[PDB]
Design a protein around this nucleic acid. Structure first.
Ligand SMILES: Nc1ncnc2c1ncn2[C@@H]1O[C@H](COP(=O)(O)OP(=O)(O)OP(=O)(O)O)[C@@H](O)[C@H]1O
Ligand SMILES: [Mg+2]
Lengths: 437, 437
RNA sequence: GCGGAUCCGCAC
RNA sequence: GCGGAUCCGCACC
RNA sequence: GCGGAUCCGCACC
RNA sequence: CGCGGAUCCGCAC
């Protein structure tokens, strides 16, 4: 009962406390003071500026507004100077407009140069767009900032908050547009129960329609899909979650889950009872950001899954896990072992030249005719999915992601049986197999 | 060695001696005296009437001519009454067209009733062309009767003589048409090396052309394919044999092959080396004619084969064996065991009604979303191909042929391992698996 | 009987 | 996956 | 200025 | 293969 009581308690988990707020205001005031000493033009943007930031995620964003006549090189050099001059400690990121990330009075700060611009139609960067996003949202989001926080909390608790490749979920900007459109958490959730994979939500035009894909129209740029990196399966998960929530609302939807964590002996028994082949490809993690690594782990998994398909090991699902030192690609197959013998297709009976060649190979068994065509019994190179993947991975490393493939080329290990359960992959195995807690 | 030395030596084991000719001659006159006494129209046809029957395969075809104003009932009654009166001892065993099969002074005789007809179109019985085949062949075949016998011997020795369902090979009539068309064995064999699955041989127009299938046009009826029941694989086998024969001619081509005959222990070790599941379905032979039986064993084998494919046991080949008392359906599969768990497909995420129903079923493991669609891990009833077929044959007996299925319903047994290698099916197993000498 | 085509039913 | 029907084709010569 | 990856499109009948 | 686009990123040469 009392969805309202639940949302009241959910806000406690999600609204920054008075101390975190004070710390942000003090950093902001100081930052303004330092910027104003330099005579510079600037805007505070983002979640801090709109008071929509989540408990524990305090960060200030300052965009430095330069004349459009300035060159990109001038933008970088001027901006980097001002950033470095205005922060307690600092560090430089990005290329194009490189920006300065640092601290002011314990608070994380981003100082970003961009062109000022009168109109949204003069955008030659994503960061040129950010001030327009803010300008569109400030004043439309006032009074609803806690609705935004509820939505962000709901998504974060369920592992689908963030558009970055590791998550492929809902961006903070997206969450704010949805609150502007529907007017609250709860109305978003009620309506989302009827979203489809062809739903188009058009903020600026004040409408919903049907399209080719799930598409949230950026009110600052009609050709841009704010939900571009929201995966189909995460869209599906959110819609399912919204239907569950309205059927039986609970504070549990806003609390992050903590893994099953079961004995390796119970896990051994589960795998035994399923009768499947369960194994991992272990290799050293490439030294690359998550946004490069995760799509490559997705590719590697997919390629090996497809190899297992072709070689008739009948894979069920794949999964992956990246630790700080190693990466793991996990597979479960319905076939533990396949026959040594297989059938190799030959030519039609009427192709004399190639029939003679086909029949000339020395084989343990006699070729045979079936349905007008010659076939031969030949011997497989590998007989288990573990052995098959060892071969594919050593041979086709190059197709398994640029950096992941190069890592596998240097070293990989195939792990199965009881040795796999001692690896730090138990939560992924459980989820992949649908183990009830 | 050398074709013409071989063919002269081949004629010895193919041309019947006087001893056998006299018994046929004596039998035909004794038969002729009995038919003349009754005063019924009769015609001698087939290989005996044209002196093209194979050594040690003497049989005499006599055709009773009836008017078209009789009907199929009277045709049957009066035709069988005559054959029984005319023969020493008789059997009445046929699939459709009535005829008496018996003996006259130690010689096989078939007494077949048919209609007279002005011309061999719009036929009434099914054997009504045979008197027209005889008229077409007597005269054209004179001087070529030993060439026919060579061809029949070549085919019989290689298990592909006869158009009956047990063989699905070349008929005697087809052999005679080919020798008339090409002029000889050797020329048939030479030209057969370039037959394809779209080769049309039109004897009446004296030409070969391309069609939709392998078609030997009946000079008596241009709509009739004399090779209708020659299977694609036996055509291929023939074409292959002619190529081999012309590259290295041998008298072995005209001699029957002895069975492979090997010890159950070698047979066991071969199966272990192949890594396959080998098993048989044993049931009692229905009391029916071969021309109904063999097609039904083919269907039953095909249905079970297709079951094994669907259930992901990856069958390699099948075969069958009919003995006096029992029939056997043989299978070799690449998968000896499959996991208990499999994937059941559920609805798309949008389809709330069906998602709810799908998600409400009790299961050991949690359902999951994949590519916009719900899936569940469920549990197989069986986990080996033998267990699968036990289920399928107990439950789908009715679809395994009319008589064959009805027998399988009253009793069947699945046999594998050591106990299979004692069943009288070693020859068929060896042929299935391509076992060498 | 078996197969092909065409239709009808049931189970998806 | 199965269960009927009809027409045609094929085997039994 | 550039740089990185992943997915898609395009060209090669 | 490469080129181009989209997406999520980074300091790049
Ligand atoms: N499947 C068939 N196709 C065409 N004609 C057939 C067929 N079966 C029988 N006949 C006709 O009936 C005749 C006798 O049939 P039969 O089965 O006795 O073969 P055959 O020609 O006598 O050769 P043999 O008896 O030596 O095997 C044939 O010559 C033929 O004209
Ligand atoms: Mg005969």
């Amino acid at each position: 009962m009392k969805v309202e009581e639940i949302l009241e308690k959910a806000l406690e988990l999600v609204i920054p406390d008075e101390e975190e707020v004070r710390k942000g205001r003090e950093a902001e005031e100081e930052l303004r003071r330092r910027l104003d000493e330099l005579g510079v033009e600037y805007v505070f943007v983002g979640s801090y500026a709109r008071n929509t930031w989540l408990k524990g995620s305090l960060e200030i964003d300052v965009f430095l507004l330069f004349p459009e006549e300035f060159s990109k090189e001038e933008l970088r050099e001027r901006g980097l100077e001002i950033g470095k001059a205005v922060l307690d400690s600092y560090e430089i990121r990005y290329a194009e407009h490189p920006y300065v990330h640092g601290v002011v009075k314990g608070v994380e700060v981003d100082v970003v140069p961009c062109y000022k611009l009168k109109e949204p139609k003069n955008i030659k960067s994503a960061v040129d767009r950010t001030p327009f996003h803010h300008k569109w949202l400030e004043g439309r989001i006032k009074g609803k900032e806690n609705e935004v926080r509820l939505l962000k909390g709901f998504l974060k608790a369920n592992g689908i908050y963030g558009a970055e490749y590791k998550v492929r979920g809902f961006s903070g900007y997206l969450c704010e547009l949805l609150i502007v459109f529907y007017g609250s958490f709860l109305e978003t959730v009620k309506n989302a129960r009827r979203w489809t994979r062809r739903t188009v939500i058009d903020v600026a035009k004040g409408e919903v329609r049907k399209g080719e894909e799930f598409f949230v129209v950026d009110p600052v740029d009609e050709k841009r899909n704010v939900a571009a990196n929201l995966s189909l399966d995460n869209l599906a998960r959110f819609v399912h979650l919204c239907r569950e929530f309205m059927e039986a609302p609970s504070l549990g939807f806003f609390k992050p889950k903590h893994p099953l964590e079961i004995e390796p002996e119970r896990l051994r028994k589960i795998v035994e009872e399923r009768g499947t082949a369960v194994f991992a490809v272990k290799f050293r993690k490439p030294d690359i950001v998550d946004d490069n690594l995760y799509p490559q782990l997705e590719r590697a998994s997919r390629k090996i899954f497809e190899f297992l398909e072709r070689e008739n090991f009948m894979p069920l699902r794949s999964a992956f896990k990246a630790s700080e030192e190693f990466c793991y690609l996990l597979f479960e197959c319905q076939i533990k072992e396949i026959s040594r013998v297989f059938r190799r297709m030959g030519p039609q009976f009427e192709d004399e030249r190639n029939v003679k060649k086909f029949l000339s190979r020395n084989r343990a068994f006699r070729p045979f005719i079936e349905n007008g065509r010659w076939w031969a019994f030949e011997m497989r190179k590998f007989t288990t999915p573990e052995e098959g993947v060892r071969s594919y991975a050593s041979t086709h490393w190059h197709t398994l992601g640029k950096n992941v493939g190069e890592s596998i080329r240097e070293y990989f290990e195939i792990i199965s049986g009881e040795k796999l359960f001692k690896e730090p992959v138990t939560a992924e195995l459980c989820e992949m197999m649908g183990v009830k807690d």
